Structure formats: structure tokens, C-alpha cells
Amino acid sequence: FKTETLTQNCNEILKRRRHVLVGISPFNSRFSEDYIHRLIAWAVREFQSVSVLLAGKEAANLLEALGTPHGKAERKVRKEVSRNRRFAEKALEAHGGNPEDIHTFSDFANQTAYRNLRMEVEAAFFDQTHFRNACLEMSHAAILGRARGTRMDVVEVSADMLELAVEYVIAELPFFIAAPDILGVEETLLAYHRPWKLGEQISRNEFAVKMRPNQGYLMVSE
């Protein structure tokens, strides 16, 4: 795996190799069982501690945006997240990591740190049109791949679909800006295979949202 970081501060965290938070979504086509094993093996080889972050309940909003009824969506999310969890448990075990170190982004709904971060992200979403637009672009990106990879037609992504999907973005973002606050680690890099444009904007202080100094984003590529 080749890696690229958001800023220079991200590079300092990377050099210490203390902890990586490996992101996995069952609704992104990158994440086969085989890839999850290769990715987690890499993470355990390269970092002192490895945790996994799975999609939370708000993944159902992505499926609903693409036409799945709510009840069916909840069931599909529970199923596929459980499947991903099992793959990650086996991969962590196989390589000397701890299969308990797996979380979804909705596991901390009642936790003070997560709630504080959610409030910060939501406040900016409602108050700042430029942040709202950046979030809507993330929500577009969260459904577009799936819309094209799993359908025969060319479905047009509507404003209504983005508004439904963006709950997913709001729910995950606390882990993109301050995962250590939530997980109780000294510092981390969130590792994922897509670039994250909004992260660069956040680090430049373009919004009423802050990238914590002990958080970085690590783009991984095979």
C-alpha cells in the first residue's frame, strides 16, 4: 500500500506509527473479504495499534436514497455490517491484532465526545452554506458509485436524494476530525482509499469545524 496524507502535521503522526483507524463500508465496492484481509494485514504490519471503523446505522439512508424502503434498508445494513465485522475480526485475529477493536460510527450516539462533535458538525451544516455544500458533495459521492454499480439504468441523483443521504455524512464526520476524542487514543490516522477534499478545506480553517491536531487522514492505495 502506498499512502498520502492531508497535511504536514498528518505526516508527523504517520511517522510515529501509534494507531490507525481502518475505515470499512459494506456498500463501497472496494471492500471484498480478500481486500479487507490485505488491508488489515498491512495496517498491523505498519502501526502499533489497529482499530476498525465500520459504517453505522445511517448507512440505511444511503440505501433509502437509492429507493430501498426504510425497513428493508435497516435489515440490509445490519446484515452487511455484521458480515464486514466478521471479516475484520478474522483478519485482525489472523495477524495478531485484537478483534475487539472494531466499532461502527453509530456506537457512541450517547457518548459526550461524539455528541459534542456531532453538534459542531451539525451547527456548521445548518449555518454555513459552503460547509453544507461540501457535505452534500460527500453525500453525492457516497451514493453515486453504488447507483452506477448496482443498477441497469442511469438514475439521476436529485437534491432530495442528497438530503436523505447526507445524514450518513453528518454521522461519520466526527471520526474524520477527532476520532481520538471518541476512541480514547492519543492520536490516529483514519485510513481510506478515496481522497478527501473536504478534509483539506477543514484544515485550512474554511469552516466552523476544526481538524484536531491529533487526527490525520491517510489515503491508501494498492
UniProtKB/Swiss-Prot annotation:
GO MF terms held by the record: aminoacyltransferase activity
One BP term from GO: pigment biosynthetic process
Membrane spanning stretches: none
Positions marked as site (Could have a critical role in the catalytic mechanism): 28, 172
Keywords linked to the UniProt accession: Transferase
Residues the entry annotates as binding substrate: 28, 168-172, 192, 197-198
Marked site positions, Could be involved in aa-tRNA binding: 76, 86, 168
Root EC class: transferase
Cysteines joined through disulfide linkages: none
Effect on the protein upon substituting residue 28 to D: It is able to bind L-leucyl-tRNA(Leu), but has almost no cyclodileucine synthase activity
E.C. numbers: 2.3.2.22
UniProt xrefs under NCBIfam families: tRNA_cyclodipep
Record protein name field: Cyclo(L-leucyl-L-leucyl) synthase
